[PDB]
Symmetry: D2
Subunit: 459 residues, 4 copies
């Protein structure tokens, strides 16, 4: 049931049906904190980092072709989802990510040994440190995997979902471009704008956010690998850093480059602090959009009720028309989460010392969570709410013609002071605008219905 | 004034304005920390003066400081407390992290002024000395945390708690006045089963009562004072009774229950009492945000929103959109509640960042803490007098919304059965009818039966 | 492989080997956001809430004994860990927690049906809404489960671990009460204190934190159950609210009470905002303690090096004595997490509207995570670091006698000005205190070794 | 002054101080929002004056405002910009959430002053009118966000970016000066393989260069101006060229690349540009915290810490502990970096909280944003001139730590083999010896061989 594996501290029992080794087993004894583990995206990024290092070590004559090929095949198995239960370590581990680095070194070594016709354990043919970790430190591997995971998740999950939601809202803005509704400022009745114009604000927000996120990508694409322990690259080949960044760029099809300054790359999480700044901006924009949708849909009788949204959940038959805006609630909740995650990231990023920032597992846990939340949240909100937004045209028109600020249209005809008098009149008593205007003899009713035209008041 | 006076410290001489009472170390800090515009708040300056006044009294009691000097120092401190020397404290929040520079600012101003009170002069011929006399038995390391806690506890007791109690009382009066006004409930922003306006306001009242208790629970820790720990917490070379005596003297002159900190190492190395007390303040900010939002949403309109209540109209804006009045008290309150949340993060970072024997994030921690107390106290005071005391129901609008909603339909269940009641609600919703119109259209009851059976006052409990 | 279950929206396929129903299945379609699910503590609290409601409904004659007993037995199976895979829903769901409430209603109904000799599915003998949810709303059930989970986790996990760590540090403070070391303020050489005194500061911090956490418990013990949809308790028995709080108190052995104001209980998360305030205070204290430990242990040659800590991880044989303070790193990282979690909670708690706060899954996700992190982190730091803190007595004494601030001891003998002169002398040149004092003739060397006694300088 | 002048708005008459230039709406705000002490910063007041000056010019160009009135309004605005009217702006941050009250403050002051410039008087007989003239073509809803962006962009361009560039240059000079000084590395706070002091500082330089680029990427969005959107974003009843013309005029008078916002609905409904730009500022705060901490830790001592570098000694403290000087510039910087983090949270909450056509958390957002810019700009300026320009290595201490560490042992591997080198390191660690002493004790090499083989200058790359 168990196997005895060894490190420099001695022997330790490891489950026979697992591929990790002594160091992973010790971490399981020493870091039994909560339930958060490395996410799949990070495990995959670590496997890609080892795959690239193995290829470059082979190219430089430092690692045999048979070992380099077996390591790459084992890494491909991780990427293919064959070893998810081989990565049991907590986020709340050593702050450099050493334990997860060793987790990957041990799993890949034991598995590559089997691929070469050998066995897992201390008789293995491939060695976690001398082979899988060759030319590397935990110090430069872990920030490399952080940036690989972050850049790929932004490119493959978040940005596509952001574009998809933007396109849906752009279509809605065009479809509702002629529907005049009442504006609200301070929650109070204002002047008209079209529903398409209001939605066009949401679209412009999402377009701006995309640009801000795109501006953060070049820094995230810079990789620490090759800085080794403290940034000098001592005892590495002078071409290794460029070569491994090039290999990661080839195998991921993403524009990874070696970090021009390895001291900044090891001592900080600055690229992720900055990139997460753009994500909390997106969270603030999505919060506003989600709130507008649920407030506009509120009712069906005692709120605003200007739009309808899809009803996705069942309800009591005695309560027809209570449609809780549950996609909006999920989205607003995750936006709060992103704001909190930003604070955790900022504290970790502010807290480097000398040659190494050792808040890294926590920083990447928060960062990748925010990406998942925003990407999946935008997908969910798009599919289950935004694509189905529809106007309640009768309710929109009823509210539009209730606003006393339609009196704006009378300025050019009878002057601001008499328009302000009609509005103050209708407000002080319980009268409409036209009832107030006719009681003052400032115009005829035909003059009113010809001059007060909301469709002419939207620019 | 252009003319200068030469003041000296152990590093040499520096020119200070001739018309000012500070000395060399104040001038060095003023010149070396030209960072933004935030200065020590008056509450903290007063707390520093109180600290020096108490130390002078105790040093005299113990025979360490002459009556003549101790009395002059206390007289100078009383001038500061009376508001006669606000312009003598020019230093930034963004100074040394222990607040040494503001400690020295008080030492220098009080020494120069006490010298004048003894018939002497300000400057290097002074009769009273900032270090040997005004700072006797003290370090910046125990003085500044003491002033922080004195300022914080007095602000909580004298400003925040009374304003919280006043706002709670007003809302309790409104809850009682509106106890019989049934309105539509809202959950998820959707129409829901009814409750009274008084019941809804009673929730706000209960929130403020709970917040008061949480704040009260934080006060004993803030009442613990570092004074007597001196440089590292050991109290080296101070009188064994000094720490208790100075806490007792501060308790006397402030009428507040200050005590000496039982562990001076915790008192110097952390801002933990303020981190915890600010936790209660951010709780209050979250409650006040919710109350303020309920008020402005319920008041929204006057025609295109909810409009269930009216609030006082206090100012117009620009002439564009004539007669439009906004819930500006609610907005000021929601804005300051956001500020308190951000201040909590800054405080938490400073509080988490002590090293060894001293936390040196102190000016920033106390700047944020006292700001949050001002914002919450003054904001509650303003919201109360300019909005809450004048909340009124719009009874016709409340009834219109309630009676035109679908949420009174369950009152029909006992009379006609669930199935017919649900059929009525479904028809009303699909066809845009009131429940009464749908029920009459189906022939399931008479108008008189509907009016007799559908009683909102029977659907809210007691 | 599948079963057809129904709700008011129609039929939907549910895995035959699962116990949930139509509403849980729909939630799995509509809320596919990230990976965070309800934690076990919350699932168990929900099961306890249903168990108590079933007992009270039976006592009041509203639910048959056979159904109430079967529901309680099913709930006990959940509490016994027999149904962990029956709760698949995301945190990022409806903001009231309706979906997880229905998840529990459906699992308990289908299972209780089997316990009565029936089947799962639409032919079941126990019904999720009419039976398992009787007298309840999602609106009052979910905040009840939040408070049950929070109070029990504070009482059973966090507070015991806090007391355990405090006791360890108290023992260390006593053991090192006579070891004089150099104080540091602003990172600079100060006057002496004992190592026991310095550790006594950590102890006092943890004692204060315990009191603050204890002060938060009475509010968390107040339960919303019985407020139903909006707080009025419409269509419930007048004794139900008190009875169900009493039953929860009996079955948990914790002092639960019914909330005196159900409107505050439904419309806010205030008790948890306040309780989390105490937890972020503990995080700030633990951060400081952990930082003191790792800085005091830094080295072994180019830092402070005043204490040693256990070495739990292997290292390269060529690098003996590099002992990374990995427990300190895990602890400081989770303290940053708690600070971020506090911001997320504060935003959710500030964001209630009218009768209901609908940020609840996110609030409780963060709150229970902070409890796990702090409780498990204190356990880990205690077992794997704090219990093994030891002084490096030679290094402590070497640094103690290096500080020029030992010149303080000369004030009472030769006066402050000449003491300040000796210190300014030793600082300006490259001399010790005694070399400077002898070169000035201010004292003999016997006078120096008799007057400068650090053990006499600690109070 | 006790004497009053009666000023009027649409709600009635109110007394204002006779010696002040503001009007009825300023007085109502002053009296109704007595909340704490934070007021509009001078940068924002100036940005409001610039906005009014540009609107007056464009309104004149379009034939909507007489030359005589437009010129007098611009003259009054120039007086504000010249610092002649700071005491005329008494309003709190904690006012209406749109900033209407400060919009009206500028309208009233400029109208009353422009009236005087035309030979008229202040008050209700004035010749120039706050609403019809100074606010022509405008709403508070587009004026306040415009002033926010004008103040923010100018502060970033004129204060923050130049100070960031200056500090970067200083640290680059230090990196070059110390390029040959090998020191011990530290990872996890533990002794690690060596690098040069110049390499370590080059990390700080690279951090500041990256931060500059991130800040620069945020500027185009802040340059977009809401002016022309009026009340809800439609620009109802304004000239079709007004929005472009006023952005062009602001670009001319500020020499900054302002443009009209392509979507006025986004510009009114959000503070998104400032939420994003502040994200870059909190990134800079995290970098500066790390740099400041490296400096104070490396300078720590002078005898019981690290002590690898020396920094300027700028002030003493109190006489207790004589001659002890603290890294006070580092402390001010770390404190303000904490402040920026908290300010980010307050900004994010305000930015997330818009509703419908207008975000009404604006005074609080801009208060925090401009504070962070002042803190970071002035803090970098202060840290540079009072600390960074004077960083110096303690060469003997650096060499002592390096040579007495265990981390040079790998230099022996190629000469005696890994196994003997590891044996030497293990013996040195267990017995408290230097590597040289352990190697000699084992008889594995000579002292001359050790000195020849163990070359730190060969262990740092290039």
């Amino acid at each position: 049931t168990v196997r005895s594996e060894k490190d420099s501290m001695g022997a330790i029992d490891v489950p026979a049906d697992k591929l990790w080794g002594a160091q992973t087993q010790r971490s399981l004894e020493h870091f039994r904190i909560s339930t958060e583990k490395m996410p799949t995206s990070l495990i995959h990024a670590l496997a890609l980092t080892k795959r690239a290092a193995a290829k470059v070590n082979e190219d430089l004559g430092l690692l045999s072709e048979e070992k380099a090929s077996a390591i790459r095949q084992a890494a491909d198995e991780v990427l293919a989802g064959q070893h998810d239960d081989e990565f049991p370590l907590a986020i709340w581990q050593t702050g450099s990510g050493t334990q997860s680095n060793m987790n990957m070194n041990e799993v890949l070594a034991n598995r590559a040994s089997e691929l070469l016709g050998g066995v897992r354990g201390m008789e293995r043919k491939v060695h976690p440190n001398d082979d899988v970790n060759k030319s590397q430190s935990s110090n430069d591997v872990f920030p490399t995997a952080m940036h690989v995971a972050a850049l790929l998740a932004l490119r493959k999950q978040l940005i596509p979902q952001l574009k998809t939601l933007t396109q849906t809202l752009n279509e809605k803005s065009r479809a509702f471009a002629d529907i005049v509704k009442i504006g609200r400022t301070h929650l109070q009745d204002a002047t008209p704008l079209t529903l398409g114009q209001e939605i066009s604000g949401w679209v412009a927000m999402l377009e701006h956010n995309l640009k801000h996120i795109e501006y953060s990508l070049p820094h995230v694409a810079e990789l620490a690998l090759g800085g080794t322990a403290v940034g000098t690259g001592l005892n590495t080949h002078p071409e290794y850093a460029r070569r491994v960044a090039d290999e990661l760029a080839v195998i991921t099809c993403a524009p990874f480059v070696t970090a021009p300054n390895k001291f900044e790359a090891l001592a900080t999480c600055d690229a992720l602090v900055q990139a997460h700044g753009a994500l909390k901006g997106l969270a603030a924009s999505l919060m506003k959009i989600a709130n507008d949708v649920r407030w506009l849909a509120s009712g069906p009788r005692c709120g605003i009720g200007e739009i309808s949204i899809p009803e996705n959940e069942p309800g009591a038959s005695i309560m027809p028309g209570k449609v809780n805006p549950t996609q909006c609630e999920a989205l607003t909740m995750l936006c709060c989460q992103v704001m909190g995650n930003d604070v955790a990231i900022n504290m970790g990023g502010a807290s480097g010392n000398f040659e190494l920032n050792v808040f890294r597992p926590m920083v990447i846990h928060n960062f990748l969570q925010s990406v998942r939340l925003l990407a999946d949240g935008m997908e969910s909100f798009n599919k289950h709410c935004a694509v189905g937004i529809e106007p309640n045209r009768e309710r929109i028109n009823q509210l539009l013609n209730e606003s006393l600020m339609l009196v704006t249209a009378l300025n050019t005809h009878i002057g601001y002071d008499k328009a302000a008098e009609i509005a103050k009149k209708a407000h002080k008593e319980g009268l409409t605008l036209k009832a107030a205007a006719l009681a003052l003899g400032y115009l005829s009713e035909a003059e009113f219905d010809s001059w007060v035209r909301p469709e002419q008041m939207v620019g």
